[PDB]
Amino acid sequence: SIGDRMKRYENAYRIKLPERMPVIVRIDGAHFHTYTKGCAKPFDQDLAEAFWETCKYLAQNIMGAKLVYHQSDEISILITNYDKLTTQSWFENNLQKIASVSASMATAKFNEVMREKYPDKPLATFDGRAQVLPQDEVANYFIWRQQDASKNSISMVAQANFPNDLPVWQKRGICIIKEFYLRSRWSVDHETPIISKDREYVEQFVYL
Amino acid sequence: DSIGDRMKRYENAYRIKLPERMPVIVRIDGAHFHTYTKGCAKPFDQDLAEAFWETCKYLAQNIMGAKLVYHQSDEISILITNYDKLTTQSWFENNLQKIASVSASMATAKFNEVMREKYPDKPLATFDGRAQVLPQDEVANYFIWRQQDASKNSISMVAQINWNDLPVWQKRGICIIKEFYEKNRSRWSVDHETPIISKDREYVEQFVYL
Amino acid sequence: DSIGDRMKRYENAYRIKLPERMPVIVRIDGAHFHTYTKGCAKPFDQDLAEAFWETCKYLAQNIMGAKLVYHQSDEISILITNYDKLTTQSWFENNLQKIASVSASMATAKFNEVMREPLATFDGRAQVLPQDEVANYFIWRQQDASKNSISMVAQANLNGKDMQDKLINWNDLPVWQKRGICIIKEFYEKNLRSRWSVDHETPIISKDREYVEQFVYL
Amino acid sequence: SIGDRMKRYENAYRIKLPERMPVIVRIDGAHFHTYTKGCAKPFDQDLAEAFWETCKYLAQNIMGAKLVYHQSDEISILITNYDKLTTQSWFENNLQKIASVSASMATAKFNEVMREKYPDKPLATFDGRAQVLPQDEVANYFIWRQQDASKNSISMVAQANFPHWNDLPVWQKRGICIIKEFYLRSRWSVDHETPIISKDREYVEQFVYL
Ligand SMILES: Nc1nc2c(ncn2[C@@H]2O[C@H](COP(=O)(O)OP(=O)(O)OP(=O)(O)O)[C@@H](O)[C@H]2O)c(=O)[nH]1
Ligand SMILES: Nc1nc2c(ncn2[C@@H]2O[C@H](COP(=O)(O)OP(=O)(O)OP(=O)(O)O)[C@@H](O)[C@H]2O)c(=O)[nH]1
Ligand SMILES: Nc1nc2c(ncn2[C@@H]2O[C@H](COP(=O)(O)OP(=O)(O)OP(=O)(O)O)[C@@H](O)[C@H]2O)c(=O)[nH]1
Ligand SMILES: Nc1nc2c(ncn2[C@@H]2O[C@H](COP(=O)(O)OP(=O)(O)OP(=O)(O)O)[C@@H](O)[C@H]2O)c(=O)[nH]1
Ligand SMILES: Nc1nc2c(ncn2[C@@H]2O[C@H](COP(=O)(O)OP(=O)(O)OP(=O)(O)O)[C@@H](O)[C@H]2O)c(=O)[nH]1
Ligand SMILES: Nc1nc2c(ncn2[C@@H]2O[C@H](COP(=O)(O)OP(=O)(O)OP(=O)(O)O)[C@@H](O)[C@H]2O)c(=O)[nH]1
Ligand SMILES: [Mg+2]
Ligand SMILES: [Mg+2]
Ligand SMILES: [Mg+2]
Ligand SMILES: [Mg+2]
Ligand SMILES: [Mg+2]
Ligand SMILES: [Mg+2]
Ligand SMILES: [Mg+2]
Ligand SMILES: [Mg+2]
Ligand SMILES: [Mg+2]
Ligand SMILES: [Mg+2]
Ligand SMILES: [Mg+2]
């Protein structure tokens, strides 16, 4: 056949992550330094809330999503596929499919939320990447990301003053977690802890 | 720094790059469109395709190395070359995940924007993207394999009356190509006179063998 | 310099690395060993087996992070851990093509020196496993080892249980003829020394999972 | 079953090279700086002669092998798999299988040849890597290695007389090649008249462009 030939060229880059391992997917904004030219400083409230709604939507549509952390213009999502013994994988851990769909989902909701408040704003695009992490390295990832949060935070505030203790999401970002009330829901945790002081906040979704 | 170096190695473990100076094909297919096209008209919705055609142009405009964009059903195939000269650079330096995700993202934002207008309240449409490389002699055969699947889907959609009288886009899908016009220049435009590539192979190979 | 950078980009396109701090398994199967073992005894050749046992030792003595080397038929599996400490380095920095080739190269180098008393060649592949699957791997190889052994004895001269039922006691046969064999580091006294030994009393991993899990969990 | 799940982990690193494309395989000696301690300087005949035979054995067993180039302790091999429309790739372009069996092949033979003259010599080991190249670069690759071989040749010769030339044979100056020779029988022989590729581009491209 010729479909066998063409599909063969395709499969040469059909990469699959090994299963039963933590999966972290990061979605950073594409050229947001130009996109946030009209946004306010040091932090834009409307811009931050757009991510929060976007993070929920991602968590609501991604199989195995347990935790979503937001900062600056990036979104990181912890995905587990070893909850039970027969737990299925999202797209069978198809590397390209995970990175693209997540980016696509984060692109759809973010735009539709932003355009409601800003109908003249240009389209916003996102890049996505996937990776695996050993269990003992999952908490260290979000710590490393949160240390990047605070560093960027103090740099953004000091840039206004010359060339004390801001709110939570302005200091170390926030997370979107599962909440119970018996039904399940995702909600923005404004009381986000410093992960280095409360590692179990992440590890509760890692070791299970 | 120290902790960032360790984390980067895990990330770089799946930092795959496509080899340079080779034809690149990015296919962007719509996720769960069988559910999404519930309200759309059968067998051919002119507004459904027009939203794709507006997206195809958007993709070709922003994707570095874009030469041709063939549309069919719910999928979009983009041909990319990075060997136009010796100083030619690749899109995102041929980062596999980045090309696949940015493309699927660009396709998503433009499609929803067009569809939102004149259809208020429609559910969000999403896309998945994949990248690959092809030897020059196989590039034409890729589109033929795609143009053949189009006609297969076309006649099967008509069934569930002359088929050959139907428009070229309903029968064989429609490519979009950079057209040259005079004003005061280049311009991406939809080719409604899209030929049967199996017959006219140079229609695609013209961008391949540069 | 400039040209070299260009070529390297093509080469680096397939410089793939396994994620670190994760159990790495390397399997080395023989190439065309059906032809190679023509002069060898059936169902089992003692001289052919002992060569692998020396090869497994040679490998373990040289693979950085090697903890367990299981032998069976014409295959050689090796458990490699790189998370023993906090500053534990990875063999070749987990370069996939490298550890797959140097392994096969090593096994080739020794297996020919021993047997020279044609040429045998090998293939090598590497992968990572989650901690709770390492045990299941060697079990899978060991269970496969038994099936081949029962099917080999029955031959000269349907299901595996049916063949065992008919056929000369099979359980009377030694361990290596039954469920393959492992080689591990043993600690002995000759005055507190250490060496890689061929564990002739290799347990059924399905029964004794800790036999392998001791190398997976610190 | 458990067998299906286990093969799944394995398949996660069962990488395949794209087909209909030049495949270059490089085989380099592992820590030969130690192995060649007993060997002469700057150019050891018996060491190089062992590689020449190894290059024969490699080309005699690699499906699609066209050209083999020897330098220092490395061995490069050009592999095409598009000579015909039905040409099959070696090991179906399995990256790990190509890389490993190649190095295993080299190791098995190199130790056999070297043992004839040096029975006291320790075991030699090789590492193998595999890649693909667009046709434009195949000649360039071998030039890159050959220009590298020339640099080292001049420097190493300069080591013996001063601390810190064209009269020397070809292999001591710019390495050597192994091509299939026709005499109607065929055989892989050592081209002792191996040209400077940068001048004779067709010497390599003749296997590339078919
Ligand atoms: N004013 C304002 N700018 C922000 C805010 N959050 C993110 N940004 C902008 O987003 C950028 C984040 O860093 P990057 O993601 O590396 O910037 P980039 O130009 O998008 O680079 P790429 O991610 O590679 O596209 C910063 O430079 C800021 O200018 C915000 O809350 N307010
Ligand atoms: N009404 C209408 N439906 C279409 C049109 N084009 C494609 N479709 C629908 O899209 C489907 C194409 O098959 P798929 O691409 O596999 O549909 P899918 O649900 O997106 O499945 P995935 O490819 O896995 O994402 C067909 O079954 C059609 O029902 C169109 O032009 N008009
Ligand atoms: N220009 C350039 N040359 C390199 C680079 N890396 C290695 N080389 C040279 O290219 C030659 C090819 O031999 P290799 O075995 O691939 O080099 P290497 O440094 O050992 O690379 P590894 O074996 O993967 O560790 C070596 O002699 C190096 O000196 C590079 O990144 N850029
Ligand atoms: N007579 C005999 N043959 C053996 C013995 N051990 C292994 N073999 C041979 O080794 C083979 C093991 O299966 P494979 O590894 O698939 O054989 P292969 O020919 O190397 O196939 P590939 O691995 O794909 O190259 C059997 O077919 C046997 O013929 C032995 O102890 N005695
Ligand atoms: N359950 C299961 N078993 C498999 C599968 N593939 C291979 N096996 C068995 O597992 C054993 C592993 O041997 P391999 O080295 O992979 O031999 P192979 O099947 O030729 O694989 P390659 O040499 O890479 O082509 C084989 O003897 C097969 O009988 C699979 O997909 N599922
Ligand atoms: N005496 C002698 N030594 C040689 C000759 N050719 C190569 N060598 C040795 O082979 C070595 C090749 O160096 P590299 O390939 O860059 O690295 P390596 O020493 O093999 O170590 P690795 O590549 O990391 O395994 C040189 O350092 C030389 O010492 C030769 O003709 N005569
Ligand atoms: Mg980025
Ligand atoms: Mg950004
Ligand atoms: Mg950022
Ligand atoms: Mg679809
Ligand atoms: Mg489709
Ligand atoms: Mg076998
Ligand atoms: Mg096999
Ligand atoms: Mg074998
Ligand atoms: Mg090297
Ligand atoms: Mg070397
Ligand atoms: Mg070398």
Author numbering:
A (entry chain C): 3 to 165, 190 to 207, 213 to 239
B (entry chain D): 2 to 161, 187 to 210, 214 to 239
C (entry chain B): 2 to 118, 124 to 163, 172 to 181, 187 to 210, 213 to 239
D (entry chain A): 3 to 166, 189 to 207, 213 to 239
From the paper:
The tRNAHis guanylyltransferase (Thg1) family comprises enzymes from all three domains of life, all of which catalyze reverse addition (3′–5′) of nucleotides to polynucleotide substrates. Similar to yeast and human Thg1, BtTLP is a tetramer consisting of a dimer of dimers.
In the BtTLP/GTP complex a GTP molecule is observed in the activation site for all four monomers, bound in a similar orientation to the dGTP nucleotide in the hTHG1/dGTP complex. A second complete GTP is seen in two of the four subunits of the BtTLP tetramer (monomers A and B), with a second partial GTP observed for monomers C and D.. In the BtTLP/GTP structure, however, there are additional contacts between T38 and the bound GTP, with main chain carbonyl-N2 and OG1-N3 interactions provided by this residue. In contrast to the hTHG1/dGTP structure where the second bound dGTP nucleotide was highly disordered so that only the 5′-triphosphate moiety was visible in the electron density map, the GTP-bound BtTLP structure reveals complete density for the second nucleotide. In the BtTLP structure, however, the carboxylate group of E12 participates in salt bridge interactions with two arginines, R28 and R131, both of which contact the triphosphate tail of the GTP in the nucleotide transfer site. In the BtTLP structure, however, the side chain of the third carboxylate, E76, is located roughly 4 Å away from the aliphatic chain of R28, a residue shown to be important in binding the incoming GTP molecule.
